[PDB]
Design an enzyme around this catalytic site. Sequence first.
Site, PDB file in Angstrom:
ATOM      1  N   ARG A  54       0.864  -1.238   0.000  1.00 20.84           N
ATOM      2  CA  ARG A  54       0.000   0.000   0.000  1.00 20.84           C
ATOM      3  C   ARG A  54       0.891   1.277   0.000  1.00 20.84           C
ATOM      4  O   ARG A  54       0.518   2.326  -0.561  1.00 20.84           O
ATOM      5  CB  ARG A  54      -0.999  -0.008   1.188  1.00 20.84           C
ATOM      6  N   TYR A 107     -12.042  21.317 -14.087  1.00 20.89           N
ATOM      7  CA  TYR A 107     -12.632  20.101 -14.493  1.00 20.89           C
ATOM      8  C   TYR A 107     -13.930  19.773 -13.680  1.00 20.89           C
ATOM      9  O   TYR A 107     -13.992  19.949 -12.511  1.00 20.89           O
ATOM     10  CB  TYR A 107     -11.633  18.930 -14.428  1.00 20.89           C
ATOM     11  N   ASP A 181      -4.363  21.934 -11.041  1.00 20.10           N
ATOM     12  CA  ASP A 181      -4.465  20.819 -11.999  1.00 20.10           C
ATOM     13  C   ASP A 181      -3.656  21.162 -13.227  1.00 20.10           C
ATOM     14  O   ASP A 181      -4.115  21.984 -14.075  1.00 20.10           O
ATOM     15  CB  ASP A 181      -5.935  20.473 -12.307  1.00 20.10           C
ATOM     16  N   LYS A 206      -3.416  11.109 -18.891  1.00 17.14           N
ATOM     17  CA  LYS A 206      -3.395  11.806 -20.137  1.00 17.14           C
ATOM     18  C   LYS A 206      -2.017  11.755 -20.804  1.00 17.14           C
ATOM     19  O   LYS A 206      -1.587  10.713 -21.280  1.00 17.14           O
ATOM     20  CB  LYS A 206      -4.081  13.183 -19.962  1.00 17.14           C
TER      21      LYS A 206
HETATM   22  C1  LIG Z   1      -9.322  -6.970   7.756  1.00 17.61           C
HETATM   23  C2  LIG Z   1      -8.595  -5.990   6.881  1.00 17.61           C
HETATM   24  N1  LIG Z   1      -9.327  -5.098   6.151  1.00 17.61           N
HETATM   25  C3  LIG Z   1      -8.682  -4.155   5.445  1.00 17.61           C
HETATM   26  C4  LIG Z   1      -7.344  -4.163   5.266  1.00 17.61           C
HETATM   27  C5  LIG Z   1      -6.798  -3.141   4.336  1.00 17.61           C
HETATM   28  O1  LIG Z   1      -6.532  -3.789   3.089  1.00 17.61           O
HETATM   29  P1  LIG Z   1      -5.351  -3.355   2.023  1.00 17.61           P
HETATM   30  O2  LIG Z   1      -4.032  -3.728   2.660  1.00 17.61           O
HETATM   31  O3  LIG Z   1      -5.599  -4.146   0.756  1.00 17.61           O
HETATM   32  O4  LIG Z   1      -5.445  -1.812   1.916  1.00 17.61           O
HETATM   33  C6  LIG Z   1      -6.527  -5.071   5.973  1.00 17.61           C
HETATM   34  C7  LIG Z   1      -5.082  -4.982   5.821  1.00 17.61           C
HETATM   35  N2  LIG Z   1      -4.348  -5.816   6.698  1.00 17.61           N
HETATM   36  C8  LIG Z   1      -2.931  -6.130   6.542  1.00 17.61           C
HETATM   37  C9  LIG Z   1      -2.016  -4.985   6.020  1.00 17.61           C
HETATM   38  P2  LIG Z   1      -2.411  -6.714   8.247  1.00 17.61           P
HETATM   39  O5  LIG Z   1      -3.582  -7.434   8.741  1.00 17.61           O
HETATM   40  O6  LIG Z   1      -1.087  -7.368   7.986  1.00 17.61           O
HETATM   41  O7  LIG Z   1      -2.161  -5.464   8.999  1.00 17.61           O
HETATM   42  C10 LIG Z   1      -7.180  -5.964   6.812  1.00 17.61           C
HETATM   43  O8  LIG Z   1      -6.495  -6.886   7.520  1.00 17.61           O
HETATM   44  C1  LIG Z   2      -7.920  18.546 -16.400  1.00 17.35           C
HETATM   45  C2  LIG Z   2      -8.407  17.229 -15.866  1.00 17.35           C
HETATM   46  N1  LIG Z   2      -8.053  16.867 -14.598  1.00 17.35           N
HETATM   47  C3  LIG Z   2      -8.567  15.741 -14.078  1.00 17.35           C
HETATM   48  C4  LIG Z   2      -9.263  14.848 -14.814  1.00 17.35           C
HETATM   49  C5  LIG Z   2      -9.635  13.581 -14.133  1.00 17.35           C
HETATM   50  O1  LIG Z   2      -8.719  12.571 -14.567  1.00 17.35           O
HETATM   51  P1  LIG Z   2      -9.064  10.964 -14.693  1.00 17.35           P
HETATM   52  O2  LIG Z   2     -10.008  10.811 -15.863  1.00 17.35           O
HETATM   53  O3  LIG Z   2      -7.748  10.257 -14.945  1.00 17.35           O
HETATM   54  O4  LIG Z   2      -9.813  10.603 -13.385  1.00 17.35           O
HETATM   55  C6  LIG Z   2      -9.645  15.147 -16.139  1.00 17.35           C
HETATM   56  C7  LIG Z   2     -10.476  14.195 -16.863  1.00 17.35           C
HETATM   57  N2  LIG Z   2     -10.948  14.661 -18.113  1.00 17.35           N
HETATM   58  C8  LIG Z   2     -11.532  13.807 -19.143  1.00 17.35           C
HETATM   59  C9  LIG Z   2     -12.426  12.633 -18.651  1.00 17.35           C
HETATM   60  P2  LIG Z   2     -12.487  15.002 -20.227  1.00 17.35           P
HETATM   61  O5  LIG Z   2     -11.663  16.208 -20.229  1.00 17.35           O
HETATM   62  O6  LIG Z   2     -12.765  14.189 -21.456  1.00 17.35           O
HETATM   63  O7  LIG Z   2     -13.768  15.198 -19.511  1.00 17.35           O
HETATM   64  C10 LIG Z   2      -9.231  16.374 -16.639  1.00 17.35           C
HETATM   65  O8  LIG Z   2      -9.527  16.751 -17.900  1.00 17.35           O
END
Ligand SMILES: Cc1ncc(COP(=O)(O)O)c(CN[C@@H](C)P(=O)(O)O)c1O
Ligand SMILES: Cc1ncc(COP(=O)(O)O)c(CN[C@@H](C)P(=O)(O)O)c1O
Lengths: 391, 391, 392, 392
Positions: A54, A107, A181, A206
């Site tokens: 993470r 945006y 942005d 982009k």
């Molecule tokens: C029950 C439970 N629900 C959520 C999460 C968060 O998931 P992500 O790590 O994919 O963000 C955990 C994470 N746990 C390990 C790091 P650990 O248990 O080793 O601390 C967890 O145990």
């Molecule tokens: C300046 C600007 N900053 C943020 C974002 C959000 O990025 P993500 O799509 O990767 O979440 C956009 C998105 N824009 C297109 C969908 P469009 O311009 O076609 O609407 C943007 O233009």
Amino acid sequence: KLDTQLVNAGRSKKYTLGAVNSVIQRASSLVFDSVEAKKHATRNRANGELFYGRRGTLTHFSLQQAMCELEGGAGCVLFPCGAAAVANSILAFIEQGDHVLMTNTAYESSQDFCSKILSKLGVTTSWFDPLIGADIVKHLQPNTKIVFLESPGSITMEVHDVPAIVAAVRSVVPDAIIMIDNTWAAGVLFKALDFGIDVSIQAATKYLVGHSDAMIGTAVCNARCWEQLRENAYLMGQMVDADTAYITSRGLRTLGVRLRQHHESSLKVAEWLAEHPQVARVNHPALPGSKGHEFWKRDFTGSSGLFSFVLKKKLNNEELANYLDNFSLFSMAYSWGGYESLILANQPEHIAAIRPQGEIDFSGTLIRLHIGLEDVDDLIADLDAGFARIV
Amino acid sequence: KLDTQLVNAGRSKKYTLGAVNSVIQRASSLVFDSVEAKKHATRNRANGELFYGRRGTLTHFSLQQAMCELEGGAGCVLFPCGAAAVANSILAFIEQGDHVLMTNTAYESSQDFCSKILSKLGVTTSWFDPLIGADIVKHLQPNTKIVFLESPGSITMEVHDVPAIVAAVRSVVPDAIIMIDNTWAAGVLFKALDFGIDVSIQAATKYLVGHSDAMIGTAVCNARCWEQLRENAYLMGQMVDADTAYITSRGLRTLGVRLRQHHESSLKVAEWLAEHPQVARVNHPALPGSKGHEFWKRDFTGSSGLFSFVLKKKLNNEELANYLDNFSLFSMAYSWGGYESLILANQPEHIAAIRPQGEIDFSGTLIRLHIGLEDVDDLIADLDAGFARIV
Amino acid sequence: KKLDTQLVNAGRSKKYTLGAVNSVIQRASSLVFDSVEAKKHATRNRANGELFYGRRGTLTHFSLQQAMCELEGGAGCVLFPCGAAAVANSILAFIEQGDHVLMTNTAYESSQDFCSKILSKLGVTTSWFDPLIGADIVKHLQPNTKIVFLESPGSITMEVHDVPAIVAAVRSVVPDAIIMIDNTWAAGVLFKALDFGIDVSIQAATKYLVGHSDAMIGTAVCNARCWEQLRENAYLMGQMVDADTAYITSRGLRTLGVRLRQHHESSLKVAEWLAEHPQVARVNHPALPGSKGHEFWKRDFTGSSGLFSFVLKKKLNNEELANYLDNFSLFSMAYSWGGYESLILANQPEHIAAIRPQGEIDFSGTLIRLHIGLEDVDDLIADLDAGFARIV
Amino acid sequence: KKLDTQLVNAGRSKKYTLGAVNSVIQRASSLVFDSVEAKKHATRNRANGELFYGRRGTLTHFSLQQAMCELEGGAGCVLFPCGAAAVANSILAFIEQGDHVLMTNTAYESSQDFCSKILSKLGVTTSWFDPLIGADIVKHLQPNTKIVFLESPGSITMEVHDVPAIVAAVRSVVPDAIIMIDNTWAAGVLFKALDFGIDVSIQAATKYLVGHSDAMIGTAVCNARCWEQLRENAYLMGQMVDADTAYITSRGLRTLGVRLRQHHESSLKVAEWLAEHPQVARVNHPALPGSKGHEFWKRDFTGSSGLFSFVLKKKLNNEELANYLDNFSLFSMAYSWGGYESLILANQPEHIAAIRPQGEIDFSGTLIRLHIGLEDVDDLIADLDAGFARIV
Ligand SMILES: Cc1ncc(COP(=O)(O)O)c(CN[C@@H](C)P(=O)(O)O)c1O
Ligand SMILES: Cc1ncc(COP(=O)(O)O)c(CN[C@@H](C)P(=O)(O)O)c1O
Ligand SMILES: Cc1ncc(COP(=O)(O)O)c(CN[C@@H](C)P(=O)(O)O)c1O
Ligand SMILES: Cc1ncc(COP(=O)(O)O)c(CN[C@@H](C)P(=O)(O)O)c1O
Ligand SMILES: [Ca+2]
Ligand SMILES: [Ca+2]
Ligand SMILES: [Ca+2]
Ligand SMILES: [Ca+2]
């Protein structure tokens, strides 16, 4: 030199391990050989030592170093897309009773995050005209916590006077976090952090990815703001997958060759349009006379390929279909930044709905183009057949 | 039948397109052939029609259908990891002035999201003992908006009486959103939605991926709560990458064969430990006498392989190193759910710091094991050499 | 069609992209038939772009194949796990015991070693010709010659063939020969091999088509005459490339124009500087006047890539070689080329003599091969100048 | 070592995993040398797991290779883009004009077609033997026999060789033969080929090792005697697999035990039900008593996978075949096998006769091959029973 920087950014031997590109290290679990190693990694978990997926793996660290070198930052926080970078960057600095001040050309989903999510949390938002410059002081409140910029503006392409805004804001609310942005400029054509902005946000989706596949957000932070953004975004579980991080690093390599073609092609299309009988106005930051062109010319070191123009006609539904449905080379799609040229229409009344506490000043259909890597003369030919369909 | 369901979940022909597995469709931009097509996609943008990569591609849709079939939901919202699923699920339903009621055995970053992020936004949180059952009514407030469950509990493994909690909560605050972190059960060993819970959250990172590489969060929602979770999480830019979505679908295929081995091995280790001279207590939901075992036996249809035990000794730093540093088969790492067996230690005082408004009731070092796919007798041999190092 | 527009669009039919910009990535061995009738239809079309079995390809491969036939003007595109597999297996697909293969002595060393170590023990003989032999190729043709194997520019030494002369000469004597070229330096696109009467254009798509030094893949684009035999004989050897690699190769095409133009502009600027440099004997760059076969390049090609070599005035000893190569800041030591990063490799005249069968070399200083990447050309020239100061 | 613990850990040295559980994915053609000295060291060790050039592999390949040598007890593991490429190229690596190849007539059809269509035109002859010939193999050996090519259980018909008898017989006459087996059905692990005096164990790692029907890859694990020749001759043909595929194959190993045990338990339960079924003539499952070579399986193998076949009492006509195959709900029609999804394919006795050279078939009803996946075995039996109701 930008080109040499792009080719080498983040490619330390500790990340490439004998290859040209960084390794792809897929992991959640990261292994500690000993109690002492776990203690070392724990103390350095936000300092580039392997700790838990993470927080990142070597692949992430490599992209983070590249983005810090390219944008001149203390740190780079990663997200699953640009919209997540915007929302979580703003969230990381707000509290109940704060005010957010945002350009009315942000945006739309950035606007909507504020209007629909922040409003329930005791945070108020208001808006300003992108050309306000130093007169932004009239919008500053004693509880203004964030000043959110986007230059050029979404869709309509207005360029801010960042120097004037930044000086104004620091003079009145020096505790404010000023964000931008910086997606249009791919973070490299406008060095936001050098102008006093605290956080430079990109939809890395982009121009950094460059190929319309991968989705990723970045937030490059100065030293004042990095820790709080990083740790608060971590608490919202923000990260991007290793493979996407790899592909983003890989996009950087061709960014300079791509952006130079995008600039040259789109400016020549913009110039041709500006002289066309069926066009009212052309909004391209590089084109003389466009809104805030002077600030683009002073503050940026190039253009990308996204811009818009306003037709003399407000097309009716039948005309709009005849126009957009019969393009040979431009595709209809959202996003931009890739190799393929794209086209989107917005009626004046669509844009009026997304310019809070402003007024639109055009009456024809607004066409936004992303100019890709196709031969520019082929693109112009496609645009001209388009005009014949709606004369 | 779970096994047949796992093998086929989400594998509609529209997603696999002649293959066994779903296609991997990488995209941001999704192309509309016509104005009419764009209008169709826009109306269906949250209804499984290609619109924009932030809403998903075919790969995402396939995983979403699988998770809805497996957990009995109306929709499945996706996130870049479990911590992002927890934080954003809770955020999607809160507003300034709300109260959140969370089990004191929740995953620490879930606690920290509430204590450190929600608190600045005018939302208060309090806690309860995991075995409270119907007496949770004493903790309900008129402004209780969310009741957050995790069964079994993080690290200490306490199983809630979900039926009693759910009835209590609906009797007093029927507008509450009841969520559970259902990661231990991989969403399939405890059918949370059938018990009255609104949202079943997983760190899909764990048993659904199954191999310790990929990171992803899921939130399966009933019909009452799906729209608000989906649209608010969308406003925070939450999504997962296509390839991760593919790999998660792919983990599902072996989930039943994996979970049966995890159950059989970990229960036999738990039984052996429970009889060992150097062990004080064993916390395994499947083991008779463990906290809330009776509820596990009534409400679950199997076990996974994560559990903990408490040593008779509180190991000092030198003993802790001698123990953990010299394991042959168990690795030290965070997370769990994979094929590899892992080991983590927590001192009583570490756990005391993460049980708000509770009291710990052990005094020796707590060892958490994830039991993987290695021969169980080899694992037991490794544990017994461990005990000889600290006798 | 204009190259840059072609590159952007090549292979991107709606049946492959399914709503996205790029083709889908369809990972599969098993491909499912809904019925006996569907299976019969797939079986008939198993070499014609219907889903049949992953060894034959998925929609991802079909897309790349379409793209490659379009760009190189072929009837078909056979795929392989790397360049060396494309060379070896394309030659294998057309030979039988008793045949003779005539290959340029500037061929990539592995292509040579395949002929001399594998083909020899299968009853197939090989001989070699000078790359500038042109019309005089007729001198080396044999009654049993089956393949004439071209590589232009040459591996390392960069000599450009007079392809028109060679092909006319071969066809005048052995019209039914299979004429193949390793067209990797041109990326298949700066030298339209199949328009010159060549039967098979082979690339190490590893290089410029992928463009980032991170996937390996070979292609062989065939005319209609030779496609079937190449395809089916290659299939019996199990040759295929993975779907993800095919997707990345298609992806690399989209930036091939913008990249090649920078590689041309930068590499020619370096080559021009090197030619004027006091420590350089000769520059071998197809685009630089005075190099072997330059006038054939000017005539026959539509551009240059970024790979070339130069000969130092000195034959470096071992310590000077290390002091030169070890201390570069921007060029890296590595095999391959075609990527964004500049690379450098050295060969001594005696190493090159050893891989120039039935011919002689034309130089005596250390030979340095450069791949000019995407870095600022003046930084690159500065790194090369510091290099020269180290071996003065 | 115990299989399940071995599977979990195979290949996972710290030099490959670099802090993660799984190996890193190192995508590369170019591999960078920091110095002339480093390059010289990599060049010496280019076939010994030092980074040299991506065609030779990256850390990702090295890890898979280590894993495969450990599991199959080999000195080396050669990698290829699919099963068919491993078969064809492993045979090619050891032959020369004038050699004879002796192959089981139950070999995978493409393995047969390689010998009869590619090898024949290279001066190499092939003949075939019945899979139950055992010690009598001596009858088919020739002074020029170089390769004896085993496949046990047989492709489609599932006959198990008496490997101990065959190998002793070969070594008694032609001790220096190369003995190879296609050991894909056993996943290399349920039949330890190299412990039985076989030189090369080949798999379509496509199948059980990958385990999910989504990557293609071949492996050939060699003893110390034959590793060099296989490796270097395979390299001259350009054979390699992509890094991502190698990572996924290593990944598939980690669940191979839990998967094979379910495939054994479920497939034997289906086979036992089919044997008792009124519409079934015979069941061909190595683990089922009464099948060809069952007692060799019981003796020589440590388990079963999930692939087997059965012969219907009826020779189905075309309409009955469609009505049977078209209307399954849980089995899908497709080639390959080894995955989580159950598959079904049909062959008529006359189709099998055609791929049984120098032998005769032993059945007259339609032959049905099943891959039993991970689905609930009673649902699978229910789908097979509805199938029978359709062709009563
Ligand atoms: C029950 C439970 N629900 C959520 C999460 C968060 O998931 P992500 O790590 O994919 O963000 C955990 C994470 N746990 C390990 C790091 P650990 O248990 O080793 O601390 C967890 O145990
Ligand atoms: C300046 C600007 N900053 C943020 C974002 C959000 O990025 P993500 O799509 O990767 O979440 C956009 C998105 N824009 C297109 C969908 P469009 O311009 O076609 O609407 C943007 O233009
Ligand atoms: C013209 C030419 N044709 C084929 C190949 C073989 O392609 P693969 O490496 O993808 O198998 C090469 C390889 N060349 C480098 C290794 P190097 O030039 O550094 O030796 C080549 O240059
Ligand atoms: C024993 C055996 N050995 C090799 C191969 C070839 O492997 P690749 O498909 O990875 O190239 C096969 C293939 N078999 C299926 C296609 P099918 O059994 O469905 O014909 C096989 O069964
Ligand atoms: Ca197009
Ligand atoms: Ca281990
Ligand atoms: Ca460099
Ligand atoms: Ca099925």
